[PDB]
RNA sequence: GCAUGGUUGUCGUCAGCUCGUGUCGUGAGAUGUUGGGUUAAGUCCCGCAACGAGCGCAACCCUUGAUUUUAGUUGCCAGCAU
């Protein structure tokens, strides 16, 4: 939370395109581009450091979101390496809301994740070279790393509420309380710990990001 | 045969018709099944508030077109004598 560290980029959007209940984070806006205030991020980022010590402190199971175009390559790897799960690719309609019949799937792509290793490999000459092996990768690039969640998650945390609508809805509904990096253009009441911050950046992202790894990695020693 | 069972024609071998869970709408409804390509085909790919499934399409059946092994009778006659 080093106010150096969070100075390398934290820029925001343009002025025309701001939501104008954020105005409480707005402090010192330039010619065209609003600025952030960093002094209340310092301190709204210790809350969400401090409100995840519940949530993961009888193992429990957090979910990471990174559609975002600079947003894969860090929530892949904070995840992994905190023994969390992810998505990356596109958010399937109804994963929380429908989360039953997507078992049906996951239990689907681990029984074709089986059969070329335990079972009859080979059971077709040509069928499963053009239809199971292609299957199996489509499987995995959109269930990603939920394929070993045992249940429910216990709380999310995301990148981006504006291209997350469907996630932050859909939470909403299920009453599960999210965590997400927050922009002049984004929400604040819909989520409930609000990280004021830029998302455009690479570096920006995975340094708060990263703080959340230690946050978690903590607990389950 | 306007009380029915069974059987059949026709649109038409046209490529469509629905369902489970989820979501949007006060509601009838909607989505999936739409959008960009491709195909004989909602056949397939990409995208997408949807994820999947069933009856249909396709294949599995018969026949014709090439070829190997088995078998020489009532079939055939290479090489033969009659
Ligand atoms: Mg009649
Ligand atoms: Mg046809
Ligand atoms: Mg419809
Ligand atoms: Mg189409
Ligand atoms: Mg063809
Ligand atoms: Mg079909």
């Given at each position: 939370?080093?106010?150096?560290?969070?100075?390398?980029?934290?820029?925001?959007?343009?002025?025309?395109?701001?939501?104008?209940?954020?105005?409480?984070?707005?402090?010192?806006?330039?010619?065209?581009?609003?600025?952030?205030?960093?002094?209340?991020?310092?301190?709204?980022?210790?809350?969400?450091?401090?409100?995840?010590?519940?949530?993961?402190?009888?193992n429990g199971?957090?979910?990471?979101?990174?559609?975002?175009?600079?947003?894969?390559?860090?929530?892949?790897?904070?995840?992994?390496?905190?023994?969390?799960?992810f998505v990356?690719?596109?958010?399937?309609?109804?994963?929380?809301?429908?989360?039953?019949?997507?078992?049906?799937?996951?239990?689907?792509?681990?029984?074709?994740?089986?059969?070329?290793?335990?079972?009859?490999?080979?059971?077709?000459?040509?069928?499963?070279?053009?239809?199971?092996?292609?299957?199996?990768?489509?499987?995995?690039?959109?269930?990603?790393?939920?394929?070993?969640?045992?249940?429910?998650?216990?709380?999310?945390?995301?990148?981006?509420?504006?291209?997350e609508r469907?996630?932050?809805?859909?939470?909403?509904?299920?009453?599960?309380?999210?965590?997400?990096?927050?922009?002049?253009?984004?929400?604040?009441?819909?989520?409930?710990?609000?990280?004021?911050?830029?998302?455009?950046?690479?570096?920006?992202?995975?340094?708060?990001?990263?703080?959340?790894?230690?946050?978690?990695?903590?607990?389950?020693?």
């Amino acid at each position: 939370m080093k106010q150096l560290l969070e100075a390398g980029v934290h820029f925001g959007h343009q002025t025309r395109r701001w939501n104008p209940k954020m105005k409480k984070y707005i402090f010192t806006e330039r010619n065209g581009i609003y600025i952030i205030d960093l002094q209340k991020t310092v301190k709204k980022v210790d809350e969400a450091f401090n409100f995840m010590r519940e949530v993961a402190s009888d193992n429990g199971t957090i979910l990471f979101v990174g559609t975002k175009k600079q947003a894969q390559e860090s929530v892949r790897d904070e995840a992994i390496r905190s023994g969390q799960y992810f998505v990356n690719h596109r958010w399937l309609g109804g994963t929380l809301t429908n989360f039953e019949t997507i078992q049906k799937r996951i239990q689907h792509l681990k029984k074709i994740e089986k059969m070329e290793a335990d079972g009859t490999f080979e059971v077709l000459p040509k069928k499963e070279v053009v239809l199971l092996k292609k299957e199996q990768e489509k499987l995995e690039r959109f269930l990603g790393g939920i394929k070993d969640m045992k249940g429910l998650p216990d709380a999310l945390f995301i990148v981006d509420p504006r291209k997350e609508r469907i996630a932050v809805a859909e939470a909403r509904k299920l009453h599960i309380p999210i965590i997400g990096i927050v922009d002049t253009n984004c929400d604040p009441d819909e989520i409930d710990y609000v990280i004021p911050a830029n998302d455009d950046a690479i570096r920006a992202v995975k340094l708060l990001t990263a703080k959340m790894a230690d946050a978690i990695i903590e607990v389950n020693q």
